[PDB]
A paper describes a structure:
[name] is one of the most significant parasites that impacts human health, with estimates that as many as one third to one half of the human population are infected. At the Center for Structural Genomics of Infectious Diseases ([name]), the first Toxoplasma Structural Genomics Pipeline was established. The genes encoding these enzymes were cloned, proteins expressed and purified, crystallized, and crystal structures were determined.
Ornithine aminotransferase, the final enzyme considered herein, is an enzyme involved in the urea cycle, TCA cycle, polyamine synthesis, and other pathways. Each monomer has a mixed α/β structural fold and consists of the cofactor PLP-binding domain (residues 87–336), an N-terminal domain (residues 17–86), and a C-terminal domain (residues 337–441). The dimerization interface is primarily formed between residues of the PLP-binding and N-terminal domains of TgOAT. The dimer is held by 3 salt bridges, Cys96–Cys96 disulfide bond, 63 hydrogen bonds and 782 van der Waals interactions. The cofactor-binding domain of TgOAT non-covalently binds PLP molecule, i.e., PLP does not form the Schiff base with conserve Lys286. Similarly to homologous OAT structures obtained in complex with the cofactor, PLP interacts with Thr135, Gly136, Ala137, Tyr171, Trp172, Glu224, Asp257, Ile259, Gln260, Lys286, Ser315, and Thr316.
Author numbering:
A (entry chain A): 18 to 439
B (entry chain B): 17 to 440
Write the structure that this text describes.
């Protein structure tokens, strides 16, 4: 049986990529840039376009697809639960949400788990928790709570996220803005310490490696020291692991590189293996319990379908030893690129990353960075930069040794060819 | 059948009674919901079963997220077929589903452009961003001056900006400081709206056709029609939140259709996916929606192909099963019967109200404990969660059969009479 989207699409008689591009222009809100490919299918580290051409996916949902596209275990868990029960609301109990929260609480070492749907919602929820905790436990004056975050942070697209962004296109013309934020440079202990002098600070909200900001890896010991400074002042450390967590950087959490156990942890993206939107906020009881009944909610948060998917997605990370995989392959990737491209390619500014969260920043005054993106695609690598000039290499962690060797050589080949053509 | 992973996992926990699940929940789940009465394990159509095999009619239905019923076979089949092929690309890449699904929606609802988000709060956030950016760029109002009018007792979600525009104490208390830019007026009051619309800095009026969480507040006939005229007069966008009222619930495709109103910006959610996965939509004319240029808005999962395939199937069910007609017919019967068998007989009922299958019975909490009604309903096989304590809600799947609806209506009336007997 053809399902309705298949049948409706068939009737539209879309043959070429351009036909699909035209369909976007006409019917899809135009808040994304043009795209170079129309993907029809995904398996593991590979995707295929509508013409059957094969690519490696080196974006992977910006680390939402760590377990690969269409991981059979995760798709079986989705389908079996979907036949049984998908939604009760948290107004009613069910036989999945509590067990899934227990599973997560034990895996990550927290007392309480709040399940939301998107990463932005996890961030919003964490800010709300930190504010309410500041008022009720720290006893700071009404409406005075402040939250410190860093320049170039990214946590989503709500108005409060826009209000705390330093990125022009994220905030421009979307005000007036939510107050209560203090922005400081990333990777700067001094600036943090000075900001923490304000007793009305509730939290410091930080990424262990800035994602959208350009795969900005801080100096060794940054997060470790930040947590000490925060604790000195009774300020919560909220660590956004929505992009860096779940084995991507070679550890279960990127915070583990600094032996930091976040006061509040955010997860998202590969929590569901890219199958359905589910995010998490985790914290100790005496923080999370400020969210009393009626004070927060979500229709789909904690729905049993997403919970079943998430438990399976997390178990795959463990069973397939994906943190070890990411560590090993990522170190090989960076060594190969540094050996083969530094010196030879003068318009590479840096090769950086941890695990399989890697970037190559190029000098956009020396090269058109889009020429690198297009060359990569010609050689079978789909990759989307950030900030124009920061090339990103973020494959599924399940990429095989042989696929990763192939991909790495296609990657080298592409940078070298761009240099040759300069 | 062979055990599923999650079944085996929980089997390892030895959680067997409703009270073991209640304890599990108390210990590991963030405690932002009230205690629950029941542990549901299976849903099908208008029915659910608890872990002991007891059957109930679900009269909450996800607050109108399950209009197509639990586990609709077509929608599962669509989920599973698409899930085997592709679930997520990001909108950074194209795929062969998102554009077609947006065209499908654009044509069904009569809009130029469709923005797909994940939750109803995200749809609201997105619409407010669009309205503000449009007011700055097209209306040329002073920078940072954009205002949005909303109504007292509105509900649109739980983001900080939503909390900043709420009049409900537990929704906002101790979550500030708050996003500025909102003007709060009484619902169902055209004179208050007209006066608020005198301010040229207003970008939008954001309103529910029937207030949902605020208590199934049905406005006077012609409220929304008049509101639209007043907004147009002032070049103010009418943002209509159909997340709870839309998609056949009230006996029409959109609740706005009762007033022959085509929203300037439409919000959908909830039953857009038949309760299977979170997907929401913001739709609008080109000259409004096109302010959202590349890089100015985004979402990881928004527009993912899996959710798109599910939504197209869910929307088609509404049509094919003539669920607007079913809701209209059964809902009219429900209100007739309850009024006829409860008013007078039961002194502590204040009002029976609703449209289609979005119905409520507001009780006098000074004269009765509303929770006694909730518990009596469950004893009689009806799962129902009130809003604001005293507003009992009756929101079944629209696929409820004539026989199931008759049975349920008789159980509901029986429950209210029983509580009254006990009061006497
Ligand atoms: C670190 C981080 N936090 C939060 C978010 C927002 O997640 P979502 O797109 O699911 O709202 C993202 C998205 O890329 C992210 O990279
Ligand atoms: C009218 C209305 N709008 C928005 C929302 C928020 O949707 P969500 O819970 O998906 O964030 C709801 C939730 O019930 C609603 O009733």
């Amino acid at each position: 049986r053809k399902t309705n989207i298949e049948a409706y699409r068939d009737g539209l008689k879309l043959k070429t990529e351009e036909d699909f591009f035209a369909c976007d222009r006409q019917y899809v809100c135009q808040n994304y840039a043009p795209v170079p490919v129309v993907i029809s299918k995904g398996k593991g580290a590979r995707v295929w376009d509508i013409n059957g051409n094969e690519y490696y996916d080196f974006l992977a949902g910006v680390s939402s697809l760590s377990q690969g596209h269409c991981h059979p275990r995760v798709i079986a868990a989705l389908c079996r639960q979907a036949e049984r029960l998908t939604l009760t609301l948290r107004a009613f109990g069910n036989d999945v949400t509590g067990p899934a929260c227990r599973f997560m609480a034990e895996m990550f070492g927290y007392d309480r788990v709040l399940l939301m749907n998107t990463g932005a919602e996890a961030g919003e929820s964490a800010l709300k928790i930190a504010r309410k905790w500041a008022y009720e436990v720290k006893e700071i004056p009404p409406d005075s709570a402040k939250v410190i975050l860093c320049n170039n942070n990214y946590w989503g697209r709500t108005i409060t996220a826009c209000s705390s962004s330093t990125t022009f296109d994220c905030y421009n013309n979307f005000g007036p803005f939510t107050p209560g934020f203090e922005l400081i440079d990333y990777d700067d202990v001094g600036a943090l310490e000075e900001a923490l002098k304000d007793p009305n600070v509730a939290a410091f909200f930080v990424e262990p490696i800035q994602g959208e900001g350009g795969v900005n890896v801080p100096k060794p010991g940054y997060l470790k020291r930040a947590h000490e400074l925060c604790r000195s002042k009774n300020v919560l450390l909220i660590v956004d692991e929505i992009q860096t967590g779940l084995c991507r950087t070679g550890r279960l959490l990127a915070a583990d590189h600094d032996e930091v156990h976040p006061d509040i942890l955010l997860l998202g993206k590969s929590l569901s293996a890219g199958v359905v939107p589910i995010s998490a906020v985790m914290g100790r009881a005496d923080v999370m319990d400020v969210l009393k009944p009626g004070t927060h909610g979500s229709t789909f948060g904690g729905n049993p379908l997403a919970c079943a998917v998430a438990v399976e997605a997390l178990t795959v990370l463990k069973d397939e030893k994906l943190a070890d995989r990411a560590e090993r392959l990522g170190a090989q990737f960076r060594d190969c690129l540094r050996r083969e491209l530094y010196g030879k390619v003068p318009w590479i500014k840096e090769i950086r990353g941890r695990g399989l969260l890697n970037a190559v920043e190029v000098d956009s005054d020396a090269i058109d960075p889009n020429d690198v993106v297009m060359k990569l695609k010609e050689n079978g690598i789909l990759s989307k930069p950030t900030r124009g000039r920061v090339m990103r290499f973020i494959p599924p962690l399940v990429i095989t040794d042989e696929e990763h060797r192939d991909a790495t050589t296609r990657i080298i080949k592409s940078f070298l060819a761009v240099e040759e053509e300069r």
